[PDB]
Design a protein around this ligand. Structure first.
Ligand SMILES: OC[C@@H]1O[C@@H](O[C@H]2[C@H](O[C@@H]3CO[C@@H](O[C@@H]4CO[C@@H](O)[C@H](O)[C@H]4O)[C@H](O)[C@H]3O)OC[C@@H](O)[C@@H]2O)[C@H](O)[C@H]1O
Length: 396
């Protein structure tokens, strides 16, 4: 059946999970005969099942969340993603111009975005004040100093979902972005060249954080978003002072609070500048969530991804996920004070890089993320991290 489509997403939080249910039925009532069969998938399994299912597109999902960056390009090159350049709506083209560049490859659009989520530090304002930190750290040393004060204050300074690998790696990403010059960074991503001292230095700076032992005790067995004891859950329940995460954070937090309501004292501050770093000041790194269409899918799928781009639907998305919607007009409904900061910093930032692992691809990304965890477990060095990236890069 054409008008029956298979829809894959990663919304495991209650409110966002329900948004998709309500969106599907809304699309089903406006387009009688259509049927959207939804599959909710935990984020850490998403890349695995998508790549596994799409090696035979005939029996894969019709509409699915993209993996992003080079990971999207891997699927595009493999013939697993449909060109939507001449298929996206005038609404999507107009309202979502800036986020559309993240789904644009070789001058061709391969998805409809729904949110833009820059990275940064999310923290408890109350835990900070309870440690004598009345001002956000502007530099990396200040951040280390503040973590010391939090540790003395009895609380774990930094929640880290190291079992999922990438949340730990995010500290390495940001440090590389801050240490390496914009060109060294660009060419390193484009050419997979990690020979510059940038990459070791960033690993060394991160090793210093590790040696302070200011993480939550079970960080190696802690996931990012699963349960009250996840790194996000620790922040939500004030068991930890902060964590380094994408702007999906407030929506994840409001799912893990004891009342499942928005975290009352959530604040945001950009990743600190690094003294002696050649990185461009104020350089953003983040994500852009968009949805792709199976090359073997019907027009019904196309009508569905464009339906997401609708301003009303984008706003309900912003409310349900407590995030920044991809649609510019839809951003008018954002009320979370920490998010309105991020939107402000978004409009006046020079660049926004994608996540480092998603920008380097599956092979390099997974190698890098694992290597960081190895170094953090004491079973690795900053040099091993770079060695791991170079090793995986041989495959492509
Ligand atoms: O390739 C897909 C997937 O991404 C990899 O993790 C990423 C990471 O993905 C983000 C993580 O968290 C998600 O936030 C969700 C938002 O709304 C809630 O309903 C929900 O339950 C949360 O899971 C988010 O949407 C993803 O974009 O982002 C940064 C990367 O460094 C990292 O690779 C996983 O390995 C892979 O399975």
């Amino acid at each position: 059946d054409d008008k029956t489509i298979t829809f894959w997403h990663n919304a495991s939080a209650g409110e966002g999970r329900q948004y998709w249910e309500n969106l599907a039925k809304s699309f089903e009532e406006a387009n009688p005969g259509t049927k959207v069969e939804i599959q909710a998938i935990q984020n850490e399994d998403f890349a695995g099942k998508l790549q596994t299912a799409m090696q035979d597109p005939a029996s894969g999902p019709d509409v699915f969340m993209s993996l992003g960056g080079a990971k999207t390009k891997e699927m595009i090159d493999a013939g697993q993603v449909m060109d939507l350049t001449d298929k996206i709506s005038d609404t999507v083209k107009t309202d979502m111009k800036t986020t559309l560049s993240a789904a644009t490859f070789d001058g061709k659009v391969y998805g409809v975005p729904v949110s833009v989520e820059p990275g940064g530090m999310w923290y408890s304002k109350d835990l900070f004040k309870k440690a004598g930190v009345s001002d956000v750290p502007a530099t990396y040393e200040e951040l280390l100093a503040d973590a010391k004060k939090l540790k003395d204050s009895g609380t774990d300074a930094i929640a880290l979902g190291a079992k999922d690998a990438w949340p730990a790696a995010h500290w390495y990403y940001w440090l590389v972005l801050r240490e390496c010059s914009p060109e060294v960074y660009d060419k390193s991503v484009q050419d997979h060249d990690f020979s510059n001292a940038c990459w070791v230095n960033a690993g060394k700076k991160l090793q210093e954080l590790k040696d302070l032992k200011v993480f939550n005790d079970g960080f190696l067995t802690t996931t990012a978003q699963q349960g009250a004891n996840s790194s996000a859950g620790l922040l939500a329940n004030h068991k930890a002072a902060m964590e380094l995460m994408g702007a999906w954070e407030p929506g994840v937090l409001k799912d893990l609070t004891p009342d499942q309501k928005p975290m009352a004292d959530l604040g945001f501050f950009a990743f600190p500048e690094v003294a002696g770093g050649e990185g461009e000041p104020g350089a953003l790194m983040g994500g852009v969530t968009y949805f792709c269409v199976n090359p073997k899918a019907s027009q019904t799928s196309i009508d569905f991804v464009n339906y997401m781009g609708e301003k009303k639907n984008q706003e309900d998305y912003a409310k349900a996920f407590s995030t920044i919607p991809a649609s510019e007009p839809a951003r008018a409904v954002v009320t979370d004070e920490s998010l309105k900061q991020v939107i402000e910093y978004l409009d006046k930032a020079p660049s926004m890089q994608l996540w480092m692992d998603t920008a380097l691809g599956t092979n390099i990304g997974n190698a890098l993320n694992a290597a960081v965890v190895n170094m953090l477990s004491g079973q690795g060095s900053p040099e091993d991290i770079v060695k791991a990236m170079q090793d995986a890069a041989q495959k492509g």
